Design a protein around this ligand. Structure first.
Ligand SMILES: CCCCCCCCCCCCCCCCCC(=O)OC[C@H](COP(=O)([O-])OCC(O)COP(=O)([O-])OC[C@@H](COC(=O)CCCCCCCCCCCCCCCCC)OC(=O)CCCCCCCCCCCCCCCCC)OC(=O)CCCCCCCCCCCCCCCCC
Ligand SMILES: CCCCCCCCCCCCCCCCCC(=O)OC[C@H](COP(=O)(O)OCCN)OC(=O)CCCCCCCCCCCCCCCCC
Ligand SMILES: CCCCCCCCCCCCCCCCCC(=O)OC[C@H](COP(=O)(O)OCCN)OC(=O)CCCCCCCCCCCCCCCCC
Ligand SMILES: CCCCCCCCCCCCCCCCCC(=O)OC[C@H](COP(=O)(O)OCCN)OC(=O)CCCCCCCCCCCCCCCCC
Ligand SMILES: NC(=O)C1=CN([C@@H]2O[C@H](COP(=O)(O)OP(=O)(O)OC[C@H]3O[C@@H](n4cnc5c(N)ncnc54)[C@H](OP(=O)(O)O)[C@@H]3O)[C@@H](O)[C@H]2O)C=CC1
Ligand SMILES: CCCCCCCCCCCCO[C@@H]1O[C@H](CO)[C@@H](O[C@H]2O[C@H](CO)[C@@H](O)[C@H](O)[C@H]2O)[C@H](O)[C@H]1O
Ligand code: SF4
Ligand code: SF4
Ligand SMILES: [Zn+2]
Lengths: 52, 208, 95, 342, 114, 178, 44, 95, 144, 52
């Protein structure tokens, strides 16, 4: 369901160790953005496919 | 609408058929078969002579641009004469598509190395050589990569035993790790799991 | 119960016990033979036979979903009890 | 055979060899080689130990899961000796000291303890009893330890008439007190040799051969009751040996003579050490008691072992006695010692 | 019976690459023994080299001799660059392995194997 | 949608006000003083440590720990030697033998788990149709020898009797999620 | 009645995720002004 | 939580944040460690009727791959339409 | 002022273990002198305390007995000494102690817990629980 | 991370190797009260990223 949760992809400008560090740090913030949506949009239902 | 069966799509399968014909018209010297699975994945099966030209065109052509080598690997099928199927999974970021290019090899028929096309392949071709013993021409540094130094054999070949032939222990007499023939306190128990009843009528083979 | 062999080793509920001359007895020197002392065969024999009216009775072992798969036992053979194939409980028809 | 001792497998660690040996003295220099040879072929090994558990750790990895059984014992307590030899089909005695302590003298170690073990093994119903002694064991011997060994042999054969007696010469190996003893003379500038070492003959034997023939005696049908002489394939004068050793360590060799009584008196000083003596009077005597000539006794080759020359294996013992300048010098750079047929 | 060559066009052109590999292995024993501080002699090491080359004395397919030469160069490189250790080099000498008797009776006494 | 992590070149002009700020940043080590402040604040926070072994880390009723063989309330073994735990075990860690008992029951004569092959996946717990094999909540059972970690049937039944009081309540707290 | 683990009615309150490192401290002039004052008085 | 109000001011200022609102440690706001029993819902195929398996079976809808070419003017095509360029974030384009 | 309240709790904790002997005993055994509410005690002598004002993870704790199964555990305490009824409460797998929600009684449940017996003479020793499979022929005991 | 390992254990029973996502769905449903704890952790986590 990644095509239903809204988030931004961090991009770098110099391609060195510092930009990658900033991208990872900004991804952790963007995962937090996703988690908030999952917690509110969690639906009811079964958990494994109804096919035994 | 069936809440248990995977949505089928429609357009992607038609698009990948059009590109599969495209690739086959342009490289008729190398292409042996083109297919698209029900998962909607395009496969090009080429003569091994065509590897470098085929991956070069697919990388540099303007209506392809498969610039990432997602991975390269072999499958061992002993019943075939050319028992090694070499698989290239390529990625196009321009067109957000994927493509599989397959060729074959035997024990004594090395493939050309695509390190000149995808540097990513350098270690992937070392892994095929190590695990399957498929030699690559023109590899800058072809040597084992995953097995222990001086390991004899190609352990991902189907006829290589799961536990191997030798094992290591420390020997206090000679004061070093030694190799000795494998003996297991408990043997690996092989389970015969195949059901004797056919599960997929769609894949049944003619009894000829 | 926990019988003891002539060699002095305890006999497990499966009847295993090293012989007198089996060297493998050395593993218990300065140690002990782990033996479970609640023989399930002896415990199951202590339960009383449940009497029921109908000729076919379902046993699931108790606890519902916490038991064993539910099966039915015929009670016609009025000379032996009906035994559950999972839990070993016994049943007998009232008349 | 009882069904649990029939040998299966192919003589690897997970095999079954049918040998259930209690090795008395497995915690010493020769002991680790005996246990390893027994353990590698898949033998149950019972290891009585009196030391701290830390000191038996290096033996734990010498057998597959379950094939090693460590037991605490006190040589003074008979009941603990029975506890160990109770389930064996062979008992190997390697107990021994190169010095005397407060609580155990040469008679205790070389006579009483072996007799106590053999007496309990006979009562327990053990098929084989392998007892290690010495080549120069004899009642007319200068060395106090070497006379007791001679007595001990006889006690053992009184209570276990069929005992197999092994007589090795000097055993040389990584942990020996033979080549590492002379290599350590360098700490005293010079090498005191009685009569300059030219009257003493030595025929040293490699530890792995001693241990490999001891294990071969646990299964050879034609060994019950015999006495064996385990010796190297070469006899050297002590001088040439000690000179060769310093050639292998590339240290400066400065030998000078020292009369046996002045040498014997020095050994008494080092024997006052409360720890493990660097030397003793008995160790100085034994170094100069010359190896007996081999006359009518089956040797290593009768137990299927080919003696290893002192030349093949010296460098693995002596490379750690070198300085950085010579660590990498190869075996060939050293001139071999000169042998003597007497 | 026609097949693509790897490198050599026939056994004689392949033996040229074999002797050239044997030369390189022969020149390197004295270094391996010196650098790895092995407890063997050069003569004993070089004999072991010769023994491994004679293990494959029956090969005749030229493509096979190409891939044995290819492997042997990889083995030579692992040793010259000290990617291998004492344990790895010393494995060729099977020093801890008792060798199985090759006579019927000894096999018969020892177990069910042929 | 995408964002720039390290792009900011919308260049402004260096005012005398701003240049003197850059210099004070460089000469006075201001950002390095801010970092010293953050570790000073942590010094006066309560540590997160717990007082083991007197305090324990929280666990849930599903916790996959040491194995155990369970019984019925009557004391009869639940295991009927179906061998499904053996067929599923990813590690081939379980060995089983069975035969008819003296009363005719289907029961195991052997039941081993080599706890050094086990990956503690809990799959055997799922495969068992009668809740005979479970992973209890014990996690403090390290030994001093390898051989003590090869559990035979007696050992596993003993763990069952040892831990039943607690196993039964964890299943009671979780079986409705299964 | 089905009892499944679900978010409460309305949903959960907002969660901060953006960078929030505060802007704090004296101005460039104040830092230099204090330091140069401390020297001048010390030199006197 | 147990910290005096003086140390709260000290560490709030040193960090430059309001720590008291967002503590690393957990106190009462956690969930109770013993919850009531669940009652989980069934799935869409728990019907008693109109639920033949052959009409909702996915494994049997798979087929062997289509063979486009094998050994048994036209406009040029791409493997797919070109990807759209991503748009810049409105939430925070320049971190 | 607040500093005085802190010293108040400090005094109240120093004197809250019953004398100087009590404070030394707890301090050198657990390296901790908090004052929890006694939740219960077991047949072995462990005492279980709690303080819900502490943060999750320090709000429950046990003071192990000083003698269990004949072993001296005044200094040698290990987490295997907690029996299974309290093991569940102590690990926060539940919320109610056994003093109010006792486990169901069974005739086969161990009455006496047993901690980690590794290294001792009680230690488990593995062995095969099956009986001999192949039975050998027994020769006649008489001449022919 | 010690707290996120607690969410892994409360769904699967293992701190790391959950074996929880399976072809066709997930093995078990979320235990009651788990989304509150995930939410309680998430509301405070951006302060942790700020301190780093
Ligand atoms: C001279 C000093 C150097 C000598 C070191 C020894 C003296 C310790 C320091 C002075 C006492 C302060 C302790 C305290 O604050 O009590 C609170 C503390 C309990 O209060 P609390 O419940 O933790 O509440 C405080 C908050 O948690 C958290 O409260 P907080 O973090 O907000 O800080 C409280 C307060 C504390 O700061 C101060 O220093 C005052 O800080 C302030 O308010 C600002 C400081 C002004 O008291 C103790 O724990 C007593 C510890 C000492 C017990 C000894 C046990 C007996 C052992 C005897 C044998 C072995 C002895 C060693 C042999 C050598
Ligand atoms: C009246 C007349 C007045 C005359 C006097 C005028 C005096 C003016 C004040 C001058 C103060 C000079 C102090 C030295 C400052 C300094 O040199 O720091 C700059 C140094 C360079 O760092 P850099 O990465 O190069 O960034 C700038 C690019 N060059 O960056 C650094 O130094 C960083 C070093 C940090 C290393 C960690 C040390 C710990 C710091 C915390 C401890 C604080 C106590
Ligand atoms: C070393 C001696 C050099 C003199 C140190 C003076 C430091 C100072 O004045 O504070 C600097 C810093 C302010 O933060 P700053 O990076 O300047 O933010 C931009 C605001 N214009 O100050 C701070 O941010 C406060 C940091 C926390 C204070 C606790 C550490 C003491
Ligand atoms: C060993 C452990 C360390 C031992 C020493 C610990 C001493 C503990 C008692 C210290 C009591 C300090 C009282 C602090 C009063 C306070 O509330 O701080 C507020 C003050 C700034 O006030 P604020 O309102 O937050 O912001 C306005 C900025 N103009 O903020 C301030 O101005 C505080 C600046 C000075 C604080 C010094 C305390 C740190 C002591 C540790 C030294 C470093 C150790 C390494
Ligand atoms: N050069 C040689 O090594 C030669 C050796 N031999 C004989 O071979 C045997 C072993 O040689 P080596 O291995 O060098 O001897 P060690 O010096 O290695 O000691 C051997 C063993 O004796 C045990 N031991 C000694 N005294 C006692 C005691 N009072 N009670 C219990 N155990 C005791 C030691 O156990 P702990 O370590 O716990 O004391 C040790 O494990 C001896 O009989 C020795 O005389 C014969 C010819 C040459
Ligand atoms: C007038 C002066 C004359 C010169 C002195 C006469 C020579 C007497 C000393 C000879 C050398 C002593 O050197 C000593 O050798 C003994 C014999 O192995 C070693 O003895 C010990 O070494 C190590 C120590 O853990 C053990 O592994 C070994 O088994 C043990 O025997 C000592 O480590 C070494 O210090
Ligand atoms: S937890 Fe997994 S690995 Fe361990 S015994 Fe059960 S199925 Fe096998
Ligand atoms: S433990 Fe369960 S799954 Fe395993 S054999 Fe017994 S009944 Fe079958
Ligand atoms: Zn039943």
């Amino acid at each position: 369901v990644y095509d239903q949760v809204e988030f931004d992809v961090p991009i770098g400008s110099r391609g060195d160790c510092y930009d990658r560090y900033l991208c990872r740090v900004e991804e952790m913030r963007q995962s937090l953005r996703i988690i908030e949506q999952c917690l509110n949009k969690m639906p009811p239902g079964e958990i494994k496919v109804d096919d035994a | 609408k069936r809440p248990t069966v995977r949505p089928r799509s429609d357009v992607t399968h038609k698009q990948l058929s059009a590109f599969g014909e495209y690739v086959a018209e342009i490289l008729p010297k190398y292409v042996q078969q083109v297919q698209v699975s029900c998962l909607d994945e395009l496969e090009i099966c080429i003569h091994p002579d065509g590897v470098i030209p085929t991956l070069t065109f697919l990388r540099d052509h303007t209506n392809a641009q498969f610039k990432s080598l997602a991975d390269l690997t072999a499958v061992d099928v002993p019943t075939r004469q050319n028992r090694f199927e070499i698989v290239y999974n390529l990625l196009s970021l321009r067109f957000n598509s994927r493509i599989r290019v397959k060729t074959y090899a035997d024990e004594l028929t090395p493939i050309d190395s695509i390190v000149s096309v995808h540097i990513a392949a350098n270690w992937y071709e070392r892994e095929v050589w190590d695990m399957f013993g498929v030699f690559f021409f023109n590899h800058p540094d072809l040597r084992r990569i995953l097995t222990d130094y001086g390991f004899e054999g190609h352990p991902f070949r189907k006829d290589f035993p799961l536990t191997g032939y030798v094992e290591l222990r420390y020997d206090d007499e000679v004061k070093r790790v030694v190799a000795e023939p494998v003996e297991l306190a408990q043997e690996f128990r092989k389970f015969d799991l195949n059901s004797p009843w056919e599960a997929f009528p769609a894949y049944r083979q003619p009894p000829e | 119960g926990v019988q003891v062999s002539p060699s002095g080793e305890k006999i497990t509920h499966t009847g295993q016990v090293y012989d007198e001359k089996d060297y493998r007895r050395v593993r218990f020197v300065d140690r002990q033979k782990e033996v479970n002392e609640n023989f399930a065969i002896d415990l199951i024999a202590q339960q009383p036979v449940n009497e029921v009216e109908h000729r076919i009775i379902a046993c699931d072992g108790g606890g519902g979903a916490l038991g064993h798969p539910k099966v039915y036992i015929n009670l016609d053979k009025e000379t032996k009890t009906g035994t559950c194939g999972y839990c070993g409980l016994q049943f007998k028809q009232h008349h | 055979l009882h069904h649990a001792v029939i040998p299966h497998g192919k003589g690897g660690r997970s095999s079954v060899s049918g040998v259930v040996a209690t090795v008395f003295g497995a915690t010493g220099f020769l002991g680790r080689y005996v246990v390893n040879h027994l353990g590698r072929m898949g033998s149950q090994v019972i290891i009585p130990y009196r030391c701290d558990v830390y000191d038996i750790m290096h033996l734990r990895l010498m057998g597959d899961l379950g094939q090693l059984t460590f037991l605490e014992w006190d040589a003074r307590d008979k009941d603990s000796i029975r506890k160990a030899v109770q389930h064996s089909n062979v008992v190997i005695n390697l107990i021994g000291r190169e010095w005397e302590t407060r609580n155990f003298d040469f008679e205790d170690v070389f006579v009483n303890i072996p007799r106590a073990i053999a007496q309990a093994s006979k009562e327990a119903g053990v098929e084989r009893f392998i007892h290690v002694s010495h080549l120069n064991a004899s009642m007319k011997s200068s060395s106090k330890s070497l006379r007791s060994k001679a007595v001990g042999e006889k006690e053992v054969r009184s209570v276990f008439p069929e005992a197999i007696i092994i007589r090795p010469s000097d055993i040389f190996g990584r942990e020996d007190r033979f080549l590492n003893h002379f290599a350590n003379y360098r700490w005293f500038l010079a090498v005191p040799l009685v009569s300059l070492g030219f009257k003493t003959v030595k025929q040293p034997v490699y530890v792995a051969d001693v241990s490999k023939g001891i294990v071969n005696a646990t299964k050879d049908p034609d060994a019950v009751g015999k006495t064996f002489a385990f010796t190297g394939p070469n006899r050297y004068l002590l001088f040439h040996l000690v000179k060769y050793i310093f050639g292998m360590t590339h240290r400066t060799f400065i030998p000078y003579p020292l009369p046996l009584f002045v040498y014997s008196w020095i050994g008494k000083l080092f024997g006052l050490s409360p720890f493990e003596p660097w030397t003793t009077k008995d160790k100085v005597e034994r170094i100069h008691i010359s190896d007996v000539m081999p006359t009518d006794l089956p040797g290593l080759e009768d137990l299927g072992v080919q003696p290893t020359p002192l030349e093949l294996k010296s460098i693995e013992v002596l490379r750690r006695h070198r300085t950085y300048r010579w660590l990498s010098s190869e075996i060939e750079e050293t001139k071999p010692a000169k042998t003597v047929n007497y | 019976t026609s097949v693509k060559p790897i490198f050599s066009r026939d056994l004689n052109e392949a033996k040229r690459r074999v002797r050239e590999l044997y030369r390189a292995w022969y020149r390197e024993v004295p270094n391996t023994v010196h650098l790895m501080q092995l407890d063997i002699t050069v003569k004993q090491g070089r004999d072991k080299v010769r023994e491994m080359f004679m293990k494959n004395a029956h090969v005749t397919d030229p493509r096979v001799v190409d891939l044995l030469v290819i492997k042997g160069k990889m083995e030579l490189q692992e040793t010259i660059k000290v990617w291998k250790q004492r344990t790895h080099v010393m494995r060729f000498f099977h020093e801890t392995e008792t060798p199985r008797p090759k006579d019927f009776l000894s096999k018969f006494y020892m177990g069910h194997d042929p | 949608t995408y964002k720039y992590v390290n792009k900011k070149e919308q260049e402004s002009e260096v005012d005398m006000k701003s240049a003197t700020d850059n210099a004070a940043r460089i000469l006075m080590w201001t950002e390095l003083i801010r970092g010293l402040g953050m570790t000073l604040s942590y010094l006066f926070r309560e540590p997160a440590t717990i007082n083991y072994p007197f305090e324990k880390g929280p666990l849930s009723p599903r916790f996959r720990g040491e194995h155990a063989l369970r019984r019925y309330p009557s004391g009869e073994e639940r295991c009927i030697a179906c061998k499904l735990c053996e067929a599923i075990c990813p590690a081939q860690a379980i060995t089983i033998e069975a035969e008819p008992r003296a009363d005719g029951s289907r029961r195991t004569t052997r039941y081993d788990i080599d706890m050094t092959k086990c990956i503690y996946c809990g799959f055997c717990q799922e495969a068992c149709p009668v809740d005979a094999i479970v992973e209890g909540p014990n996690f403090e059972f390290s030994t001093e020898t390898h051989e003590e970690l090869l559990y035979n049937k007696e050992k596993l039944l003993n763990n069952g009797d040892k831990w039943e009081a607690e196993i039964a309540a964890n299943i009671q707290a979780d079986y409705l999620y299964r | 009645k089905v009892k499944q683990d679900m978010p409460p009615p309305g949903g959960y309150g907002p969660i901060d995720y953006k960078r929030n490192l505060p802007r704090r401290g004296l101005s460039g002039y104040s830092m230099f002004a204090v330091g140069i004052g401390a020297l001048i008085f010390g030199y006197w | 939580a147990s910290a005096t109000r003086v140390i709260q001011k000290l560490r709030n200022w040193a960090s430059g944040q309001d720590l008291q609102a967002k503590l690393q440690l957990r106190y009462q706001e956690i969930a109770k460690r013993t919850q009531p029993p669940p009652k989980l819902p069934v799935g869409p195929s728990h019907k008693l009727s109109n639920n033949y398996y052959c009409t909702r079976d996915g494994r049997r809808e798979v087929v062997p791959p289509s063979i486009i070419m094998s050994s048994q003017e036209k406009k040029a095509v791409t493997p797919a339409p070109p990807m759209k360029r991503w748009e810049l974030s409105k939430d925070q384009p320049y971190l | 002022m607040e500093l005085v309240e802190v010293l108040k709790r400090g005094v109240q904790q120093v004197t809250g273990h019953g004398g100087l002997r009590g404070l030394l005993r707890v301090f050198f055994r657990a390296n901790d002198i908090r004052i929890g509410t006694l939740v219960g005690e077991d047949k072995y002598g462990n005492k279980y305390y709690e303080d819900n004002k502490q943060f999750f993870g320090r709000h429950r704790w046990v003071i192990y007995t000083t003698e269990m199964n004949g072993k001296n555990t005044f200094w040698d305490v290990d987490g295997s000494m907690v029996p299974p009824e309290w093991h569940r409460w102590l690990h926060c797998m539940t919320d109610d102690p056994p003093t109010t929600n006792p486990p169901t009684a069974r005739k086969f449940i161990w009455t006496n817990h047993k901690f980690n017996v590794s290294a001792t003479p009680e230690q488990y020793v593995p062995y095969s629980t099956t009986r001999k499979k192949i039975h050998e022929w027994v020769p006649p005991s008489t001449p022919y | 991370r010690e707290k996120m390992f607690e969410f892994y254990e409360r769904v699967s029973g293992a701190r790391m190797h959950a074996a929880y996502i399976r072809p066709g769905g997930v093995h078990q449903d979320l235990p009651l009260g788990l989304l509150d704890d995930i939410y309680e952790f998430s509301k405070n986590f951006s302060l942790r990223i700020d301190e780093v």
